[PDB]
From a paper:
Ddi1 is a multidomain protein that belongs to the ubiquitin receptor family of proteins. The Ddi1 proteins contain a highly conserved retroviral protease (RVP)-like domain along with other domains. The crystal structures of the RVP domains of Ddi1 from T. gondii and C. hominis were determined; they form homodimers similar to those observed in HIV protease and the reported structures of the same domain from Saccharomyces cerevisiae, Leishmania major and humans. The ubiquitin receptor family of proteins bind to ubiquitinated substrates through the UBA domain and deliver the substrates to the proteasome by interacting with the regulatory subunit of the 26S proteasome through the UBL domain.
The solution had six dimers in the asymmetric unit (ASU) with TFZ and LLG of 35 and 3173, respectively, in the space group P41212. In the ToxoDdi1-RVP structure, a hydrophobic binding cavity is formed by the side chains of residues Met398, Ph305, Phe313, Ala318, Phe322, Ile353, Thr374, Leu376, Val381 and Leu384. The MD simulations showed that RMSD values of the flaps of subunits A and B stabilized at about 5.5 and 6.5 ​Å, respectively. Of all the inhibitors tested, nelfinavir showed binding to ToxoDdi1-RVP with a Kd of 237.6 ​± ​6.3 ​μM and saquinavir showed binding to CrypDdi1-RVP with a Kd of 242.1 ​± ​3 ​μM.
Numbering used by the authors:
A (entry chain E): 296 to 340, 353 to 414, 418 to 420
B (entry chain F): 296 to 340, 342 to 344, 348 to 420
C (entry chain D), F (entry chain A): 297 to 420
D (entry chain C): 296 to 421
E (entry chain B): 296 to 343, 349 to 420
Write the structure that this text describes.
Amino acid sequence: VYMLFIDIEVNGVPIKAFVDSGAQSTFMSYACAQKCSLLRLMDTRIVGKIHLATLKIGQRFFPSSFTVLQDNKVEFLFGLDLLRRYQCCIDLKKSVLRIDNEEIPFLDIT
Amino acid sequence: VYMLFIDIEVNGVPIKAFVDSGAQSTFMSYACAQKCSLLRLMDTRRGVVGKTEIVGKIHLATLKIGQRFFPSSFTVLQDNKVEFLFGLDLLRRYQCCIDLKKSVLRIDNEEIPFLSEKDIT
Amino acid sequence: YMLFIDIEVNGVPIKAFVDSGAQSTFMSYACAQKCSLLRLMDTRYRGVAQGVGKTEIVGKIHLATLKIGQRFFPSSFTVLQDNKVEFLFGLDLLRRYQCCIDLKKSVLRIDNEEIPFLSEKDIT
Amino acid sequence: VYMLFIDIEVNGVPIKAFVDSGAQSTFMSYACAQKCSLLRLMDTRYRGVAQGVGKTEIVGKIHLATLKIGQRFFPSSFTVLQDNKVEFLFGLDLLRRYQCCIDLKKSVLRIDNEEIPFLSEKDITK
Amino acid sequence: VYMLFIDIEVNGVPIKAFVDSGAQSTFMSYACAQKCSLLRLMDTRYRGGKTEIVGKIHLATLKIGQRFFPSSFTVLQDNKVEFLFGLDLLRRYQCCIDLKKSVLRIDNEEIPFLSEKDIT
Amino acid sequence: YMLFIDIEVNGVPIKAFVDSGAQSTFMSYACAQKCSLLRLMDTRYRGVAQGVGKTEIVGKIHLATLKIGQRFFPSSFTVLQDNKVEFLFGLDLLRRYQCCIDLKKSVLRIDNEEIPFLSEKDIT
């Protein structure tokens, strides 16, 4: 998998999520916020905070809070906040993210 | 466990390993290299504002995680961020699972617990 | 003052800058936003951060419908952050459709059809 | 034909001319100017003291030189630059002056009535 | 003595200490910390030029002249000087910077300021 | 919080910052204006290559009379735009008068005479 990515959807839009256990906080790029029509949901705090958005990871939907930044390092960084909030396993034997009992396979990058 | 740490040993020396799925490459600080007496063990090596370039590479050091021993290669840096950064290279090389349900690193079939906030600053 | 053509991409009117010196066709991110093509992209990118200029690839549109004259053309192009020009019609597409830049008649001859180059009023 | 090139001769010297409809002005490199013995033909007309950061701007202008494209000869005005990126850039100025057609069907430049073929990758360096 | 330097020792290692009454705080270069093997002693306290703060040495043994002194200092990545002897330590040991005799008088003992040869 | 002394330059009371780490003595332009020394100056400066502070040199006062305690001293210094301190008493003058910065007694001993370092209240 070379670096760890997952397919997720935010507000219905397909997104490649970078799985980083070393990041305290989940971020989405401003450009990704623009692509997902989430700009209308923003804060006055770093571009702003999304207080709640719908994530579709596998077959299940998750309520999520994250920060929007101007940096396009990745479109979406799935950080330790969300990793632990949904009690995930980063399984590099099976190459999957196991969230609830469900396994989401690691990715489709260039 | 506000960040993921594990207790491991390199060449017999107890170390706190920072577990980072977002790092392509495993690094150890020069100070930790000094504490593990691995300075004499080095290699040559990055072309021509950060990441602190390189001191050298350790071709092999033996890691003890749980009751099992692992061969490792990593880079030594002057960067003091953490004593040892357990990156995606080693995470996948030993086919680890970062289990945040049970709060353990499952390496072979064995489970190594993530350290409490007390064990860290 | 340079060569422009009126085209449409996914139904949106565009002024295309005709450049035989460019290996690749590009559209600005702002034009990509105007044409609602942000969700239409790839993982196309420019390595890790060496070269000192322009800006770099935002992503690639694998296929989009171009309307030039009366005829419709399938196209691929890259999106960039630089707004220098909204759309650069490059040598990739110039040769893909075997276009002729006719500066005698001042037309782009795509197939047998001729598209006139724009007058300075049709440009700002 | 990884880009569009033509064989031309300027002041008798064989050159590979890069055909660019997106350049407002025809340019020759200083090195090409020296190899074509055009240096004794130069002017003081230049790019001032307000500058950019990269393009090594203007050495001077050649008010007229003979181009041989195919069997015909053409009078030409162009600018010399220090940038050796390409030897000679045949720009929109000259493209329109001789009412050229860039034919990518036949892979030729049609300039007065004659057709001049675009160069193969062999005729161009590594 | 184109600036004021003193010979001192930290954890046994000879160092050239730059005497600065204008610096609130004593600092050592990371390079000097490495050469003195004080790396295993670092708190790793930071701040939220001279590449800012690496970490703090809460206590290290300084030999100035024939006496030994307990010292606290910060380590920085800046190589400006190997060791900056600041006002903190200057006053803590009630030193006199004597430019008549060209000495640092720490206790009753006098440590001579170094000749330009002993420096670049 | 630091070492200050009361001095006079050309008759004007000044708070002098004592810095053994500074090679050269400097005075701010505002202090030069307060000491009526602006018309008395030279064309001294530091070239073309620099850093991102110190505000560079305005010029040199070749001689000004310093009163430290009961005794009077000839001095040279540079004027800067920087208001870091009004007057920085550097190693040049520290050694020129063979001063002792005595932190046991908290005094500057310039000859046999001792000038006390200022209390935090005497600083603003």
